[PDB]
């Protein structure tokens, strides 16, 4: 499913992401925008052979099991396919573990490179939340 900006912001809010670990809803929406373009079915393979899954592009080497990444840690205890669902619950629960991991949202290269230090509030502007 390809989420709309405000539609996604409200779903994340409901799932307790706004201000989770101090990151605003704007940060999370901006990150999903540049990570997957709001598409839950997005996947991208990396050179190390691992693959990124879903709206937040969660990596298979550490967080999920896709059965084809040697030495996967599967820290979120879920098959990577669950991350491509139209319901964002699994992606959100896993993202919560990642963001608490110590490096915060810097774990997401698109957030670091395109959201960090920007007017992220613009991403939820106009939304009835």
User: 42: how many CB neighbours lie within 10 A of its CB?
Assistant: 19
User: Looking up tokens 């009835």, which residue turns up?
Assistant: 128
Residues 19, 26: contact at Cβ < 8 Å? Answer: no
Exactly one of 27, 35, 48, 66 is catalytic; name it. Answer: 35
> What domains does the chain contain, in order, with CATH numbers?
1-129 (1.10.530.10)
The verdict on whether residue 101 carries a ligand-binding annotation is: yes
The method recorded for this entry reads: X-ray
Angle at 27 between CA 109 and CA 106, to 5 degrees: 30
Q: Mark whether 7 is an active-site residue.
A: no
Q: Mark whether 35 is an active-site residue.
A: yes
Give the span between the Cα atoms of 53 and 58, in whole angstroms: 5
Q: Give resolution, Å, one decimal.
A: 1.7
Written in H, E and C, the secondary structure of the chain is CECCHHHHHHHHHHCCCCCECCECHHHHHHHHHHHHCCECCCEEECCCCCEEECCCCEECCCCCECCCCCCCCCCCCCEHHHHHCCCCHHHHHHHHHHHHCCCHHHHCHHHHHHCCCCCHHHHHCCCCC
Exactly one of 48, 52, 87, 119 is catalytic; name it. Answer: 52
């Amino acid at each position: 499913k390809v989420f709309g900006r405000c539609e996604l912001a409200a779903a994340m809010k409901r799932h307790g992401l706004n201000n989770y670990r101090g990151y605003s809803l704007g940060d999370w929406v901006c990150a999903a925008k540049f990570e997957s373009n709001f598409n839950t079915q997005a996947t991208n393979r990396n050179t190390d052979g691992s693959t990124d899954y879903g709206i937040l592009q969660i990596n298979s080497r550490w967080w999920c099991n896709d059965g084809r990444t040697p030495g996967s840690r599967n820290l979120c205890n879920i098959p990577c396919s669950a991350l491509l669902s139209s319901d964002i619950t699994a992606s959100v629960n896993c993202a919560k573990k990642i963001v608490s991991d110590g490096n915060g949202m810097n774990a997401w290269v698109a957030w670091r490179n395109r959201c960090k230090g920007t007017d992220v509030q613009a991403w939820i502007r106009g939304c009835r939340l």
